[PDB]
Amino acid sequence: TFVSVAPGQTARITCGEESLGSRSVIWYQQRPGQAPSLIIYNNNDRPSGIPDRFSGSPGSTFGTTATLTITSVEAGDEADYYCHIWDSRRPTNWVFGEGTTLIVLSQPKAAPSVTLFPPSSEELQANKATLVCLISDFYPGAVTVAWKADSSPVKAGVETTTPSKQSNNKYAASSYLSLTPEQWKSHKSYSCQVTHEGSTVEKTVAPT
Amino acid sequence: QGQLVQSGAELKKPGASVKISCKTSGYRFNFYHINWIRQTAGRGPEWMGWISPYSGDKNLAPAFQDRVIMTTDTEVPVTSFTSTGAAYMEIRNLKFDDTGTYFCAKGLLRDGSSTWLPYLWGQGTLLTVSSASTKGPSVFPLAPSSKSTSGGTAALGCLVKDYFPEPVTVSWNSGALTSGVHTFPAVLQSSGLYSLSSVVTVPSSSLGTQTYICNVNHKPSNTKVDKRVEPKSCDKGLEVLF
Amino acid sequence: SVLTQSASVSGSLGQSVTISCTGPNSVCCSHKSISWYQWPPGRAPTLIIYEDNERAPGISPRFSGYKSYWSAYLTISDLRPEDETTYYCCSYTHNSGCVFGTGTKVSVLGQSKANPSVTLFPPSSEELQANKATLVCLISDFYPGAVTVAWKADSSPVKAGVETTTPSKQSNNKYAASSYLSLTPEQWKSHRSYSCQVTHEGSTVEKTVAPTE
Amino acid sequence: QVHLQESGPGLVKPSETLSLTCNVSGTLVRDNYWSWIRQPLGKQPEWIGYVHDSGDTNYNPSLKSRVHLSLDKSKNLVSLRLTGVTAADSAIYYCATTKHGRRIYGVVAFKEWFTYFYMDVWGKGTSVTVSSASTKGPSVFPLAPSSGGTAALGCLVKDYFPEPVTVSWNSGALTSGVHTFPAVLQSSGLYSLSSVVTVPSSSLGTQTYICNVNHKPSNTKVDKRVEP
Amino acid sequence: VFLGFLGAAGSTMGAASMTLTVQARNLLSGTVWGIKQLQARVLAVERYLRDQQLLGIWGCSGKLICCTNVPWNSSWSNRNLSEIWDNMTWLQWDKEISNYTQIIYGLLEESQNQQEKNEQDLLALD
Amino acid sequence: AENLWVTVYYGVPVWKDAETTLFCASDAKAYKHNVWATHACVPTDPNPQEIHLENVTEEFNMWKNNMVEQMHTDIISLWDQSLKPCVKLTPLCVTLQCTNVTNNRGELKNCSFNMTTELRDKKQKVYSLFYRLDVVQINEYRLINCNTSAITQACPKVSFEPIPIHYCAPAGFAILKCKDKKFNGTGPCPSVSTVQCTHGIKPVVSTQLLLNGSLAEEEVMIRSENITNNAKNILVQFNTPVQINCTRPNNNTRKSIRIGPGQAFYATGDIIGDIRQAHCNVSKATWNETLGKVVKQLRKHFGNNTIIRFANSSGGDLEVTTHSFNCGGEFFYCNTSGLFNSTWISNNDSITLPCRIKQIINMWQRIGQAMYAPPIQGVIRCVSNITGLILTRDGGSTNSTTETFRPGGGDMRDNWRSELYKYKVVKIEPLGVAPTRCKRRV
Ligand SMILES: *[C@@H]1O[C@H](CO)[C@@H](O[C@@H]2O[C@H](CO)[C@@H](O[C@@H]3O[C@H](CO[C@H]4O[C@H](CO[C@H]5O[C@H](CO)[C@@H](O)[C@H](O)[C@@H]5O)[C@@H](O)[C@H](O[C@H]5O[C@H](CO)[C@@H](O)[C@H](O)[C@@H]5O[C@H]5O[C@H](CO)[C@@H](O)[C@H](O)[C@@H]5O)[C@@H]4O)[C@@H](O)[C@H](O[C@H]4O[C@H](CO)[C@@H](O)[C@H](O)[C@@H]4O[C@H]4O[C@H](CO)[C@@H](O)[C@H](O)[C@@H]4O[C@H]4O[C@H](CO)[C@@H](O)[C@H](O)[C@@H]4O)[C@@H]3O)[C@H](O)[C@H]2NC(C)=O)[C@H](O)[C@H]1NC(C)=O
Ligand SMILES: *[C@@H]1O[C@H](CO)[C@@H](O[C@@H]2O[C@H](CO)[C@@H](O[C@@H]3O[C@H](CO[C@H]4O[C@H](CO[C@H]5O[C@H](CO)[C@@H](O)[C@H](O)[C@@H]5O)[C@@H](O)[C@H](O[C@H]5O[C@H](CO)[C@@H](O)[C@H](O)[C@@H]5O)[C@@H]4O)[C@@H](O)[C@H](O[C@H]4O[C@H](CO)[C@@H](O)[C@H](O)[C@@H]4O)[C@@H]3O)[C@H](O)[C@H]2NC(C)=O)[C@H](O)[C@H]1NC(C)=O
Ligand SMILES: *[C@@H]1O[C@H](CO)[C@@H](O[C@@H]2O[C@H](CO)[C@@H](O[C@@H]3O[C@H](CO[C@H]4O[C@H](CO)[C@@H](O)[C@H](O)[C@@H]4O)[C@@H](O)[C@H](O[C@H]4O[C@H](CO)[C@@H](O)[C@H](O)[C@@H]4O[C@H]4O[C@H](CO)[C@@H](O)[C@H](O)[C@@H]4O)[C@@H]3O)[C@H](O)[C@H]2NC(C)=O)[C@H](O)[C@H]1NC(C)=O
Ligand SMILES: *[C@@H]1O[C@H](CO)[C@@H](O[C@@H]2O[C@H](CO)[C@@H](O[C@@H]3O[C@H](CO[C@H]4O[C@H](CO)[C@@H](O)[C@H](O)[C@@H]4O)[C@@H](O)[C@H](O[C@H]4O[C@H](CO)[C@@H](O)[C@H](O)[C@@H]4O)[C@@H]3O)[C@H](O)[C@H]2NC(C)=O)[C@H](O)[C@H]1NC(C)=O
Ligand SMILES: *[C@@H]1O[C@H](CO)[C@@H](O[C@@H]2O[C@H](CO)[C@@H](O[C@@H]3O[C@H](CO)[C@@H](O)[C@H](O)[C@@H]3O)[C@H](O)[C@H]2NC(C)=O)[C@H](O)[C@H]1NC(C)=O
Ligand SMILES: *[C@@H]1O[C@H](CO)[C@@H](O[C@@H]2O[C@H](CO)[C@@H](O[C@@H]3O[C@H](CO)[C@@H](O)[C@H](O)[C@@H]3O)[C@H](O)[C@H]2NC(C)=O)[C@H](O)[C@H]1NC(C)=O
Ligand SMILES: COc1ccnc2[nH]cc(C(=O)C(=O)N3CCN(C(=O)c4ccccc4)C[C@H]3C)c12
Ligand SMILES: *[C@@H]1O[C@H](CO)[C@@H](O[C@@H]2O[C@H](CO)[C@@H](O)[C@H](O)[C@H]2NC(C)=O)[C@H](O)[C@H]1NC(C)=O
Ligand SMILES: *[C@@H]1O[C@H](CO)[C@@H](O[C@@H]2O[C@H](CO)[C@@H](O)[C@H](O)[C@H]2NC(C)=O)[C@H](O)[C@H]1NC(C)=O
Ligand SMILES: *[C@@H]1O[C@H](CO)[C@@H](O[C@@H]2O[C@H](CO)[C@@H](O)[C@H](O)[C@H]2NC(C)=O)[C@H](O)[C@H]1NC(C)=O
Ligand SMILES: *[C@@H]1O[C@H](CO)[C@@H](O)[C@H](O)[C@H]1NC(C)=O
Ligand SMILES: *[C@@H]1O[C@H](CO)[C@@H](O)[C@H](O)[C@H]1NC(C)=O
Ligand SMILES: *[C@@H]1O[C@H](CO)[C@@H](O)[C@H](O)[C@H]1NC(C)=O
Ligand SMILES: *[C@@H]1O[C@H](CO)[C@@H](O)[C@H](O)[C@H]1NC(C)=O
């Protein structure tokens, strides 16, 4: 489940089933590509290092779900939020509740910093060739790569990663094109056309 | 229609005090007054005062207006119409003309003109006022004599001598032989000691068929004497029968 | 006492007897009540008459009273031998207390005589190891109560150590007395015999013991 | 400070036995509780079980008959075992200290309470992949620089089995401008990632920029010097 | 001095004779519960009319105290005047005469029949 | 003259002991409606009267009193008629497929069963939640009573809250009140007074502990029919009341199932909150002073230097071993093993007791009647005064060593003897003859 809040406002996150008794909900925050950290233990008790902007619903209410309130929303809070339900009527939950990702809005567009690399001189002696097209610092992570042999597109041999953010608005996408040492010296130039939201950036490369 | 019992005989020196009790039984203690009347051998019978246990009202004679205190306890119920109680009297500043017998008496009626009138009396507690200390008695056995040679009778007893103060009670066989007992009063000697006598008239045919034991009790000295009277006489008029 | 009554009065058996009980106006008898009592010396009294004419509970109708404006009287019809005792009168009201009299010794005449029973006792063996010697001379069953006792030291008058009690009434409507002689242990072994004389209405009785036997 | 580090094989054949180790630095393994957490890709984390001294150790009811934990007090580290592994056991296993709690709602005396746990100091985490394939050593190829006052420079790691792959520049002396990219799973079954650094155009002068590549499943350490 | 209902229960019969109108004023007083208070208050007027009937047949219908022409037999505990009304309570008195209660009741009603019958002879002078 | 005459007297203070039909009184408290019918009851006099019978000594007897035997049946007849127009649950003796309550020794069962609807055809698969003590298995469960007696559910508009009942006597009768501060219920009474009605006693029916009663005067009072007989209960009365707090921390739900035309059975729905059991609290400081105050009065009957021990019930039934009573509508059965855990020789919070609850309670001292206590909604919490103690003595053959006391009392008359010890019934006989020199006319 995804919930978005405009920056500077207040955020709400629901996790776990409905309360059947007195609870002690434990909240966690998982940064993309990192390890989960402890945010709020015992429903609404924050340890050292967590600001008072985070507050959870008290485990004294019978019939409501575990609510995580985040006042003053910032772009740094954009991560996953899981909960650990400790209920007096339910057995011990050894599986965390299905998380909820916080989306920080007001990020309209970012320009991808594409970079194209020709195959190395050491790889050509191994009877192999592969083009690399690196794309980073782009938001939102939605791109489609289309390689070009001179002015004609290349069908098979295209290996492309899926976008993934790195603790920022910066996403990551890498496209690969497998060719032969005879294929590289054949055509005059190869292009990596990567389309962003509405734009299309293209970089070329020529042999020597 | 009850019974009033008083305390034992006590000896008090002049100037001291004495507390005479008067326990009741057989009637409602609160329904009748408690009168106290003394009698000395120089002033005649003299009423002192009464007290109502129900309310607490007292009325002392002018002769005892400033040296006699009367107190009564609370009623202890036994039945719906009878109970048990107790009444005390505290006379101070004892003199030599205060030696006599004191009585407590139950009232007559509850309402009318004679409500406080003494009707049912006790047994009396003798009070002696003197500076002499208490002296224990000396019981001596009396040899039997011949009262009738043709009748087959005799007479034996015990002799109490030189005791102080009065009085002494004499029983026989722990109160078993009370028939024929003739206890005579004591004598006032020139030193201040009393001495009475006791004698019981019994037939001569009883020798090893009855045990003669006179019980002389003197409470002021805290001593009890049990003497065995010998059934063998020495009179020449009685030996004709044995 | 401020209430004066007759010290003594007589009366034959089967008859009546009247006792006076008067005094000043402050005690008798206007606006005053009279009560009588049978008070044997040494025993507990018995209420006879209360509130002038009325008798006490349990009292035989042989008694009767009467109060004038200056004196009260008590009539004991059909006299009994046990009625020979002392009688006191009281004056009281509804508020004041009691004021007793001086004593009335009633002597019931016409009764039968009674010769005294005298028994003399020598000093016991336990008394001779003290050492002392005391003769016990007891008198009982004699009427009326008026006897004199004289002692002799081997047919010789004794004028040292003589003592005798007063006549006391018994329970069988008779009188009793007692006498003792104080002797030294030297005179008990020096005299052949000792006697106890008892005089009563001229007829004198006497008992004698013998230390020599 | 408390620094926890996990280290294991990273590749276990099906129906075998996994053996992990949490090297503890900062506190003793006896004066604290310890818990292990695994998390498959795109799923929610799953608790495996806690371990403590004095025999205080409980297991996941779903993984009870397979997991066996232990604490090495003489070496100050946490251990983990898992016999009979399958494809569903491929996850990222973490190591974290555990602090206990006591939530009271009733009258205490009637045991009307329950003990809850929470992990506060996690670890960097290790990656464990379950497959019946062999480990392949990667092949490193240097990428030459090519271009406005700025220039780009990078390396390449091609054809290798599970990343777990660590890439550093100048042995950790270059932390500004590095943008390592995730790997791509080709149709052959081999990952391949890249890593570029934005350096100024004045990079000449034999600065000797070299990328350090490490692959734990194959114990492969290759250094390739990049030159224009 | 109105001591109250039964206030003179422990006083002398002479003093308790002064409160005879106090115990007489409170002698009548004007579902599961509907049965109790109704059956009880019916027994109240039955107990009342039983004593009032006896009071009526004795020539005492309207009087609280009444004198009769029955000689007091000495076998009924021969106490005296100043010994009853001045030194005894009504509770204490009824215990002694408890044996001869129904004995006296047979004489008061028979004496009333003969008194009224002689009155008919006296009134029949015309 | 000298010959006295019989004179009849009317209105004499003469009474004899007797028995009659006593009626009620119950103030004028505005209101509604309860079991003990305060309805058709006569209001209480706003200014009650009490005449102290001066000089009067009367012999009372609390153990042979008739007011106790009469009030004992009036309360039973009161509870009987109150249940007559209420629902009968004979269709509830159906096989109950039960299971444990939803939590993590269960003391609760989530039972499902078939039930008759308003129509006489289709059934109804509705669930309930009965306690552990009101249901018994069979080889699935069944209501505990079904093999013994039929059941009748109490109407939920009647209240189980005891309000004071004043017992009165009709005209011609009177009730005597012994007002001395130290009186063991038997023997002559020094200070006596008369009243038309007794004080307002509340028909509390408890066990072991006596609640909301009257307090003794000066020292705590001990009363027993025969102290030398261990087969007779010993009633105790406190001078200072001990504070006791009971609660049922279970926010229950009332499911209103419809059974047939008109009748409606009230079931127990899902519980809101935690699964917490009921209990009662007693301050340790006060109970330590009260138990030490009673044992000081016990040594006045078993030697000055003796040892007194307290223990819980031994052999007994359920409603006697546990402090059984009503608190807010439910019937608690509390373990008193924590209150009688003492041993006294010749010379800091509260104390909690594990209480259990029953909905199907059986009629005391009768063969075939049991009622269903309807479920109460909300966290029950009552405050009461424990003012008495029903105690028994174990007849040990080695006597005059150390005596042990154990509680009990499964008879209501002891709960009525506790407040009728100072009352007895007499009848007024105003016809009294007396002699005086007074004769009538010719
Ligand atoms: C018969 O006799 C028996 C036995 O005596 C008796 O049984 C007793 O019953 C009562 C009630 O039925 C029961 O009370 C409960 O107690 C729970 C435990 O409290 C105790 O511990 C806490 C914490 O101690 C830990 O932490 C310490 C450091 O802080 C550490 O040093 C300790 O070692 C330990 O680890 C302690 O704070 C409590 O002290 C309270 O009591 C003092 C008097 O003794 C009092 O002076 C204190 O002020 C304090 O009272 C409160 O103080 C502030 C407000 O001023 C609150 O913030 C505190 O939380 C205190 O409540 C105790 O020593 C306690 O948790 C229970 O309260 C929670 O649970 C109920 C029911 O679920 C909820 O309705 C409450 O709202 C509350 O829920 C909050 O707390 C829990 C736990 O922290 C959280 O998980 C919840 O999410 C929620 O917290 C959040 O919401 C609230 C909203 O208000 C918010 O304010 C918070 O900030 C947070 O955002 C409950 O009070 C008692 O345990 C039990 N047993 C005993 C032995 O007493 C029967 O009742 C008697 N029967 C009768 C009829 O009398
Ligand atoms: C319960 O039972 C108790 C006991 O059984 C009973 O109490 C008895 O009640 C009866 C009445 O029914 C009493 O009988 C009457 O008593 C009257 C009291 O006598 C007066 O005189 C006292 C003496 O005063 C002298 O001495 C003082 C010094 O002490 C001196 O200064 C004075 O000047 C004077 O010389 C006096 O102390 C006493 O005072 C009491 O009474 C007043 C009330 O009047 C009270 O206020 C005081 O505090 C104190 O208690 C009193 O003044 C007596 O007068 C009376 O005689 C008259 O009346 C009868 C008729 O009753 C007439 O026939 C007669 O001719 C007189 O006119 C009568 O004797 C009896 O004494 C009580 N006590 C007993 C028996 O022990 C209760 O009444 C019972 N109650 C109930 C409810 O049943
Ligand atoms: C020994 O003596 C003590 C002292 O009297 C006694 O304490 C009493 O406890 C009982 C319960 O155990 C109390 O009765 C209930 O009290 C609660 C709470 O009362 C509050 O509100 C009143 C105002 O009404 C305040 O004055 C008071 O201070 C409290 O703040 C009430 O909620 C209860 O009401 C229900 O029951 C009544 C009678 O049964 C009904 O008339 C009433 O309508 C309620 O019934 C229904 O209510 C709802 C409909 O409105 C419905 O939803 C419910 O389900 C229910 O069907 C009740 O009055 C009592 O107040 C306590 N006494 C005092 C003085 O406060 C001990 O119990 C006693 N010991 C023993 C063993 O008996
Ligand atoms: C005693 O025993 C009885 C059983 O006889 C229990 O009653 C059951 O209570 C459970 C609650 O846990 C009920 O189960 C729930 O039913 C809800 C109602 O479903 C309606 O909506 C669906 C459409 O969604 C309709 O098709 C259907 O016909 C109903 O109209 C569901 O919404 C619940 O689902 C929730 O929980 C599941 C749990 O995994 C989640 O995954 C879901 O996302 C959702 O959040 C749930 O299924 C059950 O129906 C009740 N049965 C009866 C007969 O009443 C008592 O609770 C029990 N009491 C105690 C104290 O133990
Ligand atoms: C729900 O109920 C279960 C009961 O199965 C609770 O799990 C139990 O928790 C207790 C203590 O939290 C464990 O006891 C422990 O035993 C070890 C010895 O093995 C001892 O060293 C510890 O100090 C502790 O006493 C118990 O083992 C455990 N049961 C199981 C099967 O693991 C659980 O905590 C309850 N949860 C809630 C929310 O109520
Ligand atoms: C539980 O016991 C306590 C005892 O502390 C009870 O409180 C007391 O209740 C009585 C009446 O039941 C109060 O007596 C009253 O005193 C006033 C004083 O003027 C008087 O005017 C009244 O006519 C009445 O006699 C007493 O004051 C009160 N105690 C306190 C400290 O207020 C309590 O009622 C008991 N609860 C029960 C039985 O449910
Ligand atoms: C279950 O009773 C009945 C059932 C059916 N028809 C009945 N007709 C009179 C009944 C009673 O009077 C009775 O037997 N009861 C038992 C004791 N009782 C209590 O309140 C109580 C209950 C449990 C624990 C402690 C006290 C008073 C009354 C309810 C009675
Ligand atoms: C029983 O309950 C009453 C009331 O619920 C308690 O009285 C309270 O005592 C506290 C002190 O701890 C005071 O602060 C409150 O003001 C009191 N309440 C009232 C209404 O006065 C009582 O202490 C409890 N007793 C026990 C043994 O639990
Ligand atoms: C009442 O309380 C006593 C003691 O609090 C309980 O006795 C316990 O019984 C269990 C078995 O059910 C034992 O394991 C405990 O050791 C016992 N406790 C003690 C202190 O001996 C008793 O079970 C409770 N219930 C009843 C009905 O008596
Ligand atoms: C009565 O109280 C005593 C203590 O006041 C209890 O004694 C306990 O005995 C056990 C032995 O089995 C110990 O382990 C406990 O520590 C003792 N209690 C305390 C407070 O020290 C005794 O169990 C109690 N009896 C009942 C029936 O509850
Ligand atoms: C009874 O009292 C009367 C009062 O008139 C009195 O004349 C009579 O002597 C008394 N009788 C007795 C035996 O007391
Ligand atoms: C943990 O660290 C120690 C020393 O730091 C090392 O010897 C050991 O091999 C490490 N554990 C693993 C699993 O490598
Ligand atoms: C009085 O009572 C006695 C009983 O002792 C009886 O014999 C006598 O006949 C009674 N008097 C009359 C006049 O009947
Ligand atoms: C009391 O019980 C004992 C023995 O159980 C018995 O002997 C006695 O008669 C009973 N009644 C008493 C003492 O009044």
XYZ file of N, CA and C in Angstrom, chain F residues 288-353:
198
model
N -5.548 -6.852 58.945
C -4.613 -7.301 59.971
C -5.027 -6.811 61.352
N -5.714 -5.668 61.420
C -6.176 -5.144 62.700
C -7.508 -5.750 63.117
N -8.345 -6.138 62.153
C -9.649 -6.701 62.485
C -9.540 -8.162 62.908
N -8.715 -8.949 62.211
C -8.516 -10.338 62.611
C -7.869 -10.425 63.987
N -6.915 -9.535 64.271
C -6.335 -9.470 65.600
C -7.294 -8.971 66.659
N -8.343 -8.252 66.255
C -9.342 -7.777 67.204
C -10.376 -8.850 67.520
N -10.654 -9.743 66.570
C -11.605 -10.822 66.818
C -10.975 -11.914 67.671
N -9.708 -12.250 67.407
C -9.049 -13.311 68.161
C -8.881 -12.915 69.625
N -8.797 -11.613 69.913
C -8.764 -11.171 71.303
C -10.079 -11.464 72.013
N -11.192 -11.467 71.276
C -12.479 -11.837 71.849
C -12.691 -13.343 71.882
N -11.970 -14.095 71.047
C -12.071 -15.549 71.062
C -11.373 -16.159 72.272
N -10.285 -15.543 72.743
C -9.582 -16.063 73.909
C -10.403 -15.935 75.184
N -11.454 -15.114 75.177
C -12.351 -15.025 76.323
C -13.278 -16.228 76.441
N -13.184 -17.197 75.528
C -14.028 -18.382 75.568
C -13.258 -19.692 75.486
N -11.946 -19.663 75.257
C -11.148 -20.879 75.127
C -9.838 -20.745 75.891
N -9.895 -20.169 77.088
C -8.699 -19.978 77.884
C -7.920 -18.742 77.488
N -7.278 -18.095 78.463
C -6.571 -16.851 78.177
C -5.326 -17.098 77.334
N -4.616 -18.193 77.594
C -3.382 -18.532 76.887
C -3.662 -19.734 75.988
N -4.037 -19.457 74.741
C -4.294 -20.506 73.765
C -3.926 -19.987 72.382
N -3.817 -20.913 71.433
C -3.425 -20.608 70.061
C -4.642 -20.776 69.162
N -4.871 -19.797 68.290
C -5.993 -19.801 67.359
C -5.442 -19.767 65.941
N -5.888 -20.707 65.112
C -5.447 -20.815 63.729
C -6.634 -20.630 62.791
N -6.365 -20.051 61.625
C -7.372 -19.844 60.595
C -6.986 -20.611 59.339
N -7.978 -21.235 58.709
C -7.766 -21.994 57.486
C -8.981 -21.835 56.585
N -8.781 -22.119 55.300
C -9.866 -22.038 54.335
C -10.846 -23.191 54.548
N -11.909 -23.198 53.748
C -12.885 -24.275 53.821
C -12.244 -25.601 53.430
N -12.761 -26.684 54.006
C -12.291 -28.021 53.669
C -13.310 -28.708 52.768
N -14.092 -29.626 53.331
C -15.176 -30.231 52.578
C -16.367 -29.287 52.483
N -16.908 -29.177 51.277
C -18.048 -28.313 51.058
C -18.396 -28.228 49.587
N -19.472 -27.494 49.323
C -19.985 -27.285 47.979
C -19.314 -26.051 47.370
N -19.798 -25.610 46.209
C -19.202 -24.450 45.554
C -19.630 -23.152 46.230
N -20.937 -22.939 46.368
C -21.487 -21.688 46.892
C -21.220 -21.486 48.385
N -20.422 -22.340 49.027
C -20.068 -22.189 50.430
C -18.560 -22.094 50.627
N -17.783 -22.853 49.849
C -16.329 -22.755 49.936
C -15.845 -21.378 49.504
N -16.503 -20.783 48.516
C -16.134 -19.473 48.005
C -17.088 -18.412 48.538
N -16.541 -17.231 48.831
C -17.348 -16.085 49.229
C -18.324 -15.731 48.114
N -19.512 -16.324 48.154
C -20.501 -16.170 47.099
C -21.480 -15.060 47.453
N -21.780 -14.215 46.471
C -22.635 -13.046 46.664
C -22.905 -12.428 45.297
N -23.705 -11.365 45.293
C -23.998 -10.605 44.086
C -23.321 -9.244 44.159
N -22.692 -8.840 43.054
C -21.966 -7.568 42.963
C -22.237 -6.990 41.575
N -23.252 -6.133 41.485
C -23.577 -5.458 40.247
C -24.453 -6.230 39.285
N -24.868 -7.445 39.634
C -25.714 -8.228 38.755
C -25.185 -9.626 38.506
N -23.866 -9.780 38.531
C -23.245 -11.088 38.394
C -23.000 -11.696 39.771
N -22.868 -13.018 39.797
C -22.710 -13.768 41.038
C -21.263 -14.228 41.155
N -20.528 -13.604 42.069
C -19.116 -13.878 42.269
C -18.930 -15.045 43.230
N -17.850 -15.797 43.017
C -17.475 -16.932 43.864
C -15.976 -16.796 44.117
N -15.623 -16.139 45.219
C -14.258 -15.700 45.467
C -13.528 -16.650 46.407
N -12.266 -16.923 46.080
C -11.411 -17.809 46.862
C -10.953 -17.074 48.116
N -11.428 -17.517 49.281
C -11.083 -16.892 50.551
C -9.884 -17.547 51.228
N -9.057 -18.275 50.476
C -7.863 -18.873 51.061
C -6.803 -17.833 51.398
N -6.923 -16.619 50.858
C -6.004 -15.543 51.168
C -6.372 -14.704 52.367
N -7.594 -14.852 52.877
C -8.035 -14.126 54.060
C -7.925 -14.945 55.338
N -8.039 -16.268 55.245
C -7.928 -17.126 56.418
C -6.625 -17.914 56.376
N -5.517 -17.214 56.147
C -4.191 -17.816 56.146
C -3.390 -17.248 57.313
N -3.833 -17.529 58.537
C -3.257 -16.913 59.722
C -3.129 -17.942 60.836
N -2.318 -17.594 61.834
C -2.124 -18.425 63.019
C -1.699 -17.508 64.157
N -2.616 -17.231 65.078
C -2.371 -16.298 66.167
C -2.064 -17.048 67.456
N -1.042 -16.581 68.173
C -0.654 -17.169 69.450
C -1.308 -16.357 70.562
N -0.891 -16.589 71.810
C -1.485 -15.874 72.934
C -1.170 -14.384 72.890
N -0.023 -14.010 72.331
C 0.360 -12.606 72.224
C 1.405 -12.404 71.130
N 2.430 -3.055 51.185
C 1.397 -2.370 51.952
C 0.290 -1.866 51.030
N -0.283 -2.780 50.246
C -1.368 -2.429 49.339
C -2.667 -3.103 49.758
N -3.091 -4.118 49.006
C -4.353 -4.798 49.257
C -4.148 -6.301 49.117
N -5.207 -7.055 49.400
C -5.208 -8.510 49.300
C -6.245 -8.902 48.257
N -5.792 -9.542 47.185
C -6.642 -9.887 46.055
C -7.060 -11.352 46.124
N -8.287 -11.624 45.684
C -8.860 -12.959 45.725
C -9.312 -13.381 44.334
